[PDB]
Design a protein around this nucleic acid. Structure first.
Length: 292
DNA sequence: CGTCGTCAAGGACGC
DNA sequence: GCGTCCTTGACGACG
């Protein structure tokens, strides 16, 4: 057993002055603005991925802002054709250099909504995520939360299932779900996976905060079963003494050992404000453990 | 250049 | 009913 764990971080790299998560405001919407910001995000993303490889960070969560406002209903810009060259170039690199990709389209995606409008708009946002990834000629996972709780859980869960079951292939095939710190725990997520085949992503912090008494190694074991290929997870840490769920501004290098050491054969996304810096710490610990 | 009013969006919460 | 906080607070008009 050589490698088997990848490390990633999210959206952009601060230590590089090359923002890849620039968006724009509806008042600016036009073909020119969209292309300009889309090109600069993508030029930076190439760079960010070149730097990641250089520093043995082969996992990355792509910003949803990459093509700003792409899902907005007033948005009608043919970014797929215009930007096809860069987009292909970034994908070829991702695949040539064995990089894992994910996206996390945000909180406005409630696929189990009671309001149809929000379902349809949720699907458009997912559509953009899938379109982006195809445009790079890559697979990738799109992670989301189960969504709302209205009318209690098992209706909510079924609203999720019924809707999931209706999505187009090339969204559903990328879709994985994450456990949260309020409503839907892992046990719930598994409930869904069992009925859907949806891969579950374990967010460690949301789980130590909302569990049914599953120990880390028990929880992992069950999730693993929901993945065809190699599981992803989200690793975050608490910000000391806050109303729990607040992401630490960086990772504690010891907490990370304790954790990564009861685990192999997964890729880890780091959810912390200082982004690449924690990625570097994460790369140290694993290099040390021969698990990178 | 620097300041700061405003930002597409759902849903849950505390007031 | 309104303000707040949620992958990463930052866009961009105005002087």
């Amino acid at each position: 057993e050589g490698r088997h764990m990848r490390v990633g971080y999210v959206s952009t790299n601060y230590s590089l002055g090359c923002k890849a998560d620039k968006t724009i405001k509806l008042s600016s919407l036009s073909e020119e603005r969209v292309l300009k910001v889309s090109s600069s995000n993508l030029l930076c993303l190439k760079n960010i991925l070149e730097w990641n490889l250089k520093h043995e960070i082969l996992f990355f969560r792509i910003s949803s802002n990459t093509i700003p406002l792409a899902s907005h209903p007033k948005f009608h810009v043919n970014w797929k054709d215009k930007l096809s060259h860069i987009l292909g170039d970034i994908g070829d690199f991702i695949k040539e250099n064995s990089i894992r990709i994910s996206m996390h389209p945000g909180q406005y995606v409630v696929l189990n909504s009671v309001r149809e409008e929000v379902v349809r708009s949720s699907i458009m946002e997912l559509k953009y995520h899938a379109d982006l990834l195809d445009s790079m000629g890559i697979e990738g996972k799109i992670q989301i939360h189960v969504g709302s709780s209205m009318n209690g859980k098992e209706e909510s869960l079924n609203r999720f299932i019924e809707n999931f079951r209706k999505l187009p292939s090339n969204i559903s095939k990328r879709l994985v779900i994450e456990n949260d710190d309020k409503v839907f725990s892992v046990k719930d997520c598994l409930w869904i996976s069992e009925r859907t085949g949806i891969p579950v992503i374990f967010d460690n912090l949301h789980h130590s905060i909302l569990n049914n008494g599953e120990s880390l190694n028990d929880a992992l074991s069950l999730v693993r079963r929901t993945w065809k290929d190699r599981p992803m997870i989200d690793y975050s840490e608490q910000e000391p003494g806050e109303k729990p769920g607040v992401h630490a501004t960086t990772i504690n290098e010891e907490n990370f050992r304790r954790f990564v050491n009861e685990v192999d054969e997964v890729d880890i996304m780091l959810e912390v404000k200082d982004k690449e810096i924690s990625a570097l710490k994460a790369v140290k610990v694993l290099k040390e453990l021969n698990k990178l």
